[PDB]
Ligand binder design. Structure first.
Ligand SMILES: CC(=O)N[C@@H]1[C@@H](O[C@@H]2O[C@H](CO)[C@H](O)[C@H](O[C@]3(C(=O)O)C[C@H](O)[C@@H](NC(C)=O)[C@H]([C@H](O)[C@H](O)CO)O3)[C@H]2O)[C@H](O)[C@@H](CO)O[C@H]1O
Ligand SMILES: CC(=O)N[C@@H]1[C@@H](O[C@@H]2O[C@H](CO)[C@H](O)[C@H](O[C@]3(C(=O)O)C[C@H](O)[C@@H](NC(C)=O)[C@H]([C@H](O)[C@H](O)CO)O3)[C@H]2O)[C@H](O)[C@@H](CO)O[C@H]1O
Ligand SMILES: *[C@@H]1O[C@H](CO)[C@@H](O[C@@H]2O[C@H](CO)[C@@H](O[C@@H]3O[C@H](CO)[C@@H](O)[C@H](O)[C@@H]3O)[C@H](O)[C@H]2NC(C)=O)[C@H](O)[C@H]1NC(C)=O
Ligand SMILES: *[C@@H]1O[C@H](CO)[C@@H](O[C@@H]2O[C@H](CO)[C@@H](O)[C@H](O)[C@H]2NC(C)=O)[C@H](O)[C@H]1NC(C)=O
Ligand SMILES: *[C@@H]1O[C@H](CO)[C@@H](O[C@@H]2O[C@H](CO)[C@@H](O)[C@H](O)[C@H]2NC(C)=O)[C@H](O)[C@H]1NC(C)=O
Ligand SMILES: *[C@@H]1O[C@H](CO)[C@@H](O[C@@H]2O[C@H](CO)[C@@H](O)[C@H](O)[C@H]2NC(C)=O)[C@H](O)[C@H]1NC(C)=O
Ligand SMILES: *[C@@H]1O[C@H](CO)[C@@H](O[C@@H]2O[C@H](CO)[C@@H](O)[C@H](O)[C@H]2NC(C)=O)[C@H](O)[C@H]1NC(C)=O
Ligand SMILES: *[C@@H]1O[C@H](CO)[C@@H](O)[C@H](O)[C@H]1NC(C)=O
Ligand SMILES: *[C@@H]1O[C@H](CO)[C@@H](O)[C@H](O)[C@H]1NC(C)=O
Ligand SMILES: *[C@@H]1O[C@H](CO)[C@@H](O)[C@H](O)[C@H]1NC(C)=O
Ligand SMILES: *[C@@H]1O[C@H](CO)[C@@H](O)[C@H](O)[C@H]1NC(C)=O
Lengths: 491, 491, 491
């Protein structure tokens, strides 16, 4: 009953989490959170974005109107999902700049198509083929009009179509490439055709291509597809002496957040802002490792599969030398605070959380948590990131852009966690130290630091006296004479 | 009279500034500075860069020699400013890869055109048109030479021009597409023409397509513009059996800092390194929010409109627990230093700045200031970042590259300020602590820490005595017996 | 003889190294390491990567089989090295999209060529030219087959080659453009030729353009080179009635780590993972200034020539105020630890290293060293980064992408060293201070801090006594009464 002991301590937990810092790759903290999303449900949620499942229709085939894609007439989407099993079932074609036309239609988000009354005099219209069957019958792309001779004549076609609305019109037409010279003249009479499609500030000028090619659905002929945008006040002109595969009208163009993704993931009823080819994913985390291909408000793709952000002090079951230092050891039995006090006196032993120091640590970690978890990444139509054919220069640059980006983000994420972690350990160490010092300063000359986080208080200090220390109102003058006597034999 | 008090503390100002740190979204420091440039005069300064106002001439029209653009002949520039009201008033034309021709001329910085002694045998030269009037007369592009039949013949043209110089020559030439067959033969006799322009390492062939395009300034025909760069030692050769629109010469090519910008900002007499479409901007700050399109030594575009870097300590009207810690509270009355001393003694009271500690904090903050505002970014011709027409793949990539870059820089800026600010707060705290500990150490056993940043000095300590503490020459043996006697009653 | 002195200290060296920190552009530490590789031996190491010296053969000429390039038949490479002096010595040619064909072959990493069973009925094979000699004899590209008439006939050629294998095939073929009409018909009999090469998914039809181009090795004609990829299950057709320069077979395509590099550096025996055009470089450092063009596991290209990373404490021949603070000064004579103890007692003076605290500093710096120098960047085929022609849009973008990337990495490198440096100095200061405090704490009331890193120990303290302090077993109760008596004159 002549002295007391008061020791400062901090909590610890039986199972901690290993995190990475600036100086240690493996240091144990009381608690952490995962910043990389690395899993998916495997399914694409159908809200909030308007998902159109292309099923066995590539957007291009929907656009041209391959008979097996008629259900997609006038459809709209925020995201068109294109499946890899999808195939073409009409006249064989190619699209110079396929990727661009697929991109610009993807991006526009609609197949809304308006028929117009092109006046095609002196040709047979509605040319059809065995390669584009409707049931047992010859057929063709719904949105195009294959013209051939009437009788023995294919005249110079020369028609116009003014755009008098105040949206942009997308026209999609083509040129037919016959197999032989015989075929060119049987169909179009002239030996060399040409197709000139123009506006007031643009043109396209195409000569047909001749030769035997491999049969696709019975045919060696082909069509190359071309497109033209006609602005308000402008006009489409089409001029041709053979081989024209005429548009029937225009597609409406829109701007907005629409896009296209290659995925075989099923569509499901649920809500997710972020879509990948592997399925929708949560965007509570700032990073993800699921896929570099995303649509919507998503974590940023990084190469790491896990990045643990520390949310607690170091676990002992820093710059200041208190935690894992002169305080030998955490207290697992302190479960209502991060920091506090154990005492021993005449009336027995006890333990109290310190609230102010506990809150200061938690506040500061919440602050870096709020900065870090506060999501800022919403992207829609972007670039292609996987490729089905080898191409060279353009594809090289596309991959290299993305590869560059991913390494830069991966690095920022790696650094950020290592920094934030070092700093969390150290600021938690600091708060412990600051409490100890605050206590030392209250004791003035009535106590000595025992070297282990505890002070020997050189006077009778009951539970009320000890509380006075914990709440910061200890009055050292009251006890000085007594203490100095025990401490130094003064009087 | 028989003891003194010496208190430490630090300055404070009535109204400080709110900054962001690693741990707080909002925390007040004495002084801060803005790192985002977000305003502009609206006007483009005419030095130190050579600014050429294109007015109503697109560079393309200046290049080709639209008669309304004659004043631009042989012009030079560091930056050609292109206006939106600019329009074309010559023969209607298209330029496949318009943007490459525009880019490489913009980058070359010059329209210096050298006229060469081309021989066109058997053809009529200087064809003209109602679409490209020169006063009351029909006219044409100054830089091109429209060739037509002579009498009843248009010969196979085969003409060459060696490059015997040590610089690259840019040849701009064209191909004429007539309206009808009648026109093709009236002009060129041949039913189908053709141009082939070749060097030892390159060849281009264009076949014109006859036909009607929309009436522009009275004309249905068109001209398409192509280009060839001939290296030193190489030879230009031109081959044509009709439809050639010949070069009269070439443009000198330069490399350097030149570029082109779209803007309607007026030009003004002033000095700015950095130009944006919105006007020139100062470049003392390291970031800006005005426009992603810049020319010259510019702050880097970031998404944030403001980012305040702290240039002073925390304002109290840290890891170390001194400032806003055991020192309750700053001193508004301390105006000649950041840190100092106040005392109560025998001869009255007083205050003095500590210079060493004030300087060390200031120096450290100036150090990071120099790092951060040190102008390092000078960029000239880049990629276009705004587009008037939809194009697909290539535009997608250009937008993605810029948007990637901006996000990465906005991040760097965000983190930097957050880091710098946490560390400034903490280093200013440390300096206060270091000074207090310095003082405690000098006092030895002659004073006691009162716990609030002050020492009770247990001896008569007059102004000279106090000064000896502030200048670090206090001799504790002189006072020790006196002090130990008042603390401990030794005598 | 009734007291002793015990000072704590740290090492120093006469000449240290200057580094950059957050707050000082120049401050001296004991030791540092360079993080930018700036030297090369100048030679390209021939392990571990398979390096193929193109010598005087551009890869394109090895691919087509220029007679001077027969030694490259069926060759493979991880890196094909292309020399400046390399030249073409065969029929002069051009390759639309040359760079993609060169890219995709470079990336495939092989010239393995499989001859196939094309049946050329009615025509003569193996056309040769004086412009492509094999010694004294006229010759031709080995991989191509120049077809011409047989007797008085050249028929319409129509062949197929199915792909029944499970890999992709690369077909490289050409079209000959004669200099005159005479030549056209002597060779091919038709006045105009045509080559149509097709698959189910693609068609290319080239019309030769007759006429003179500049004489190259005695020839005014040219051949144009095209390529077609045939996937498994698909079918190559070739259809032509003149001017076809046919393939003899195909090149095997592969995916993997191959590329091509332009360099005049000699190849030689050594081992380096990272290749630049200047020669190989070590990859122990995380950045390099040698060249933005690299192959293999390389340090990342940055703009700075040097970045010195501190591996040691501040050198004195911090946040905490010990090093270059209350310890005036380091000890050059302390060679077997970073921190330690000097004393003076009755038995004389001495000195001893502190191992725990030395290790803790070292360990933590080793840890950030391992984070930093951990080689994590391995790249192979990328984008071209230097260009020999002006091109416009695409090249602008390519340059912009690499320039963007470099400035971001150079920023990360600058920040990293400034951060880690500030932090190293601070953590080394901290460890000093922690040792001081540890020592203070053991001494309890038996010593006083002299203000300069030393303690006055107020009792007889022999060498064994001193060692008890250094090893942490000093028992203060043995000495307390004696010490209080000399400090005060009391207990
Ligand atoms: C007349 C006939 O039945 N001939 C038999 C041949 O079949 C025809 O062969 C030609 C090619 O020589 C075409 O492939 C014909 O197919 C169509 C098709 O695509 O389905 C028929 C269409 O009506 C026709 N459409 C139009 C608008 O012209 C179309 C086009 O002409 C071509 O696609 C243009 O490329 O072709 C096919 O019916 C068979 O080739 C011959 C061989 O021995 O046997 C004949 O009995
Ligand atoms: C004066 C007039 O308007 N006459 C009537 C016809 O207009 C003519 O129509 C022809 C088309 O066949 C051309 O447009 C003529 O204009 C020019 C031009 O561009 O201005 C005249 C130039 O001399 C000529 N220049 C050259 C070097 O040939 C030029 C070119 O041929 C074309 O630009 C090539 O495409 O054409 C124009 O004068 C009117 O169309 C007709 C029927 O109503 O009656 C004419 O008498
Ligand atoms: C000054 O600092 C440099 C950089 O830290 C020190 O050199 C480094 O020293 C370590 C230990 O000697 C080297 O690591 C060792 O390498 C081998 C394997 O390569 C292994 O046997 C060890 O376990 C260890 O990891 C390190 O590679 C080396 N770094 C460099 C660039 O040389 C140097 O020791 C310091 N000098 C002084 C006087 O402290
Ligand atoms: C371990 O750390 C996580 C991350 O801070 C804590 O989870 C948060 O808890 C708070 C308080 O209830 C919530 O408001 C957050 O939204 C939760 N965030 C996350 C990411 O899960 C968790 O509280 C911590 N565990 C302990 C014992 O403190
Ligand atoms: C050119 O060659 C192709 C390939 O042999 C020929 O097409 C084949 O002809 C038969 C009969 O019409 C078809 O059953 C085959 O499927 C065809 N093969 C392919 C790959 O399409 C074509 O007939 C030839 N052309 C000429 C004019 O002789
Ligand atoms: C092709 O059609 C166009 C458009 O109808 C014709 O051009 C028009 O011609 C009339 C009479 O010359 C003009 O008054 C109109 O301004 C023209 N319209 C446009 C948009 O140019 C053109 O003459 C026709 N071409 C042929 C060969 O008959
Ligand atoms: C087109 O003109 C060129 C150059 O005048 C002719 O090519 C030259 O022909 C002579 C032989 O007649 C060579 O010795 C020269 O070296 C050639 N010069 C070049 C630059 O190639 C070419 O013959 C002409 N073509 C025709 C059909 O007249
Ligand atoms: C996402 O998809 C690709 C293949 O399409 C796969 O390589 C990757 O591992 C997938 N990730 C997950 C988490 O399923
Ligand atoms: C605040 O900061 C800037 C940058 O250091 C400085 O130039 C300015 O004078 C400072 N203001 C005050 C009141 O110190
Ligand atoms: C600069 O211009 C852009 C587009 O013209 C505009 O949206 C932006 O608000 C402008 N900013 C300033 C600061 O003038
Ligand atoms: C590497 O080569 C480049 C250009 O080829 C040159 O400018 C650079 O200085 C070279 N580096 C070294 C270390 O020689």
């Amino acid at each position: 009953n002549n002295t007391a002991t008061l020791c400062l301590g901090h909590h610890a937990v039986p199972n901690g989490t290993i995190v990475k810092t600036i100086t240690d790759d493996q240091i144990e903290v009381t608690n952490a959170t995962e910043l990389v999303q690395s899993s998916s449900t495997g399914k694409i949620c159908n809200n909030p974005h308007r998902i159109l499942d292309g099923r066995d229709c590539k957007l291009m085939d929907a656009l041209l109107g391959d008979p097996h894609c008629d259900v997609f007439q006038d459809e709209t989407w925020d995201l068109y999902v294109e499946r890899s099993s999808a195939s073409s079932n009409c006249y064989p074609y190619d699209v110079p700049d396929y990727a661009s036309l697929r991109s610009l239609v993807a991006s526009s988000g609609t197949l809304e198509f308006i028929t117009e009354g092109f006046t095609w005099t002196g040709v047979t219209q509605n040319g059809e083929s065995g390669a584009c069957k409707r049931g047992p019958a010859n057929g063709f792309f719904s949105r195009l009009n294959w013209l051939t001779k009437s009788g023995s004549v294919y005249p110079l076609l020369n028609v116009t179509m003014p755009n008098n609305d105040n949206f942009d019109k997308l026209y999609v037409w083509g040129v037919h490439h016959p197999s032989t010279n015989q075929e060119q003249t049987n169909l179009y009479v002239q030996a060399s055709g040409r197709v000139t499609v123009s506006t007031r500030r643009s043109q396209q000028t195409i000569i047909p291509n001749i030769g035997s090619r491999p049969l696709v659905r019975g045919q060696s002929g082909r069509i190359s597809i071309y497109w033209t945008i006609v602005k308000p006040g402008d006009i489409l002109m089409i001029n041709s002496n053979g081989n024209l595969v005429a548009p029937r009208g225009y597609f409406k163009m829109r701007t907005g957040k629409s896009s296209i993704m290659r995925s075989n993931a099923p569509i499901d009823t649920c809500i997710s802002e972020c879509i990948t080819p592997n399925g929708s994913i949560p965007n509570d985390k700032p990073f993800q490792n699921v896929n570099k291909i995303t649509y919507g408000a998503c974590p940023k793709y990084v190469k790491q599969s896990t990045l643990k952000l520390a949310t607690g002090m170091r676990n002992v079951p820093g710059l200041f030398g208190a935690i894992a230092g002169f305080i030998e050891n955490g207290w697992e039995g302190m479960i209502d605070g991060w920091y506090g006090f154990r005492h021993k006196n005449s009336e027995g032993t006890g333990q109290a959380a310190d609230l102010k120091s506990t809150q200061a640590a938690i506040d500061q970690i919440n602050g870096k948590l709020n900065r870090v978890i506060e999501k800022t990444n919403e992207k829609f139509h972007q670039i292609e990131k996987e490729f089905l054919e080898v191409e060279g220069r353009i594809q090289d640059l596309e991959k290299y852009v993305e590869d560059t980006k991913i390494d830069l983000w991966s690095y920022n994420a790696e650094l950020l966690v290592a920094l934030e972690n070092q700093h969390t350990i150290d600021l938690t160490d600091s708060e412990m130290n600051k409490l100890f010092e605050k206590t030392r300063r209250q004791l003035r000359e009535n106590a000595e630091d025992m070297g282990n986080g505890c002070f020997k208080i050189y006077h009778k200090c009951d539970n009320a006296c000890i509380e006075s220390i914990r709440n910061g109102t200890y009055d050292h003058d009251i006890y000085r004479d007594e203490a100095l006597n025990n401490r130094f034999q003064i009087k």
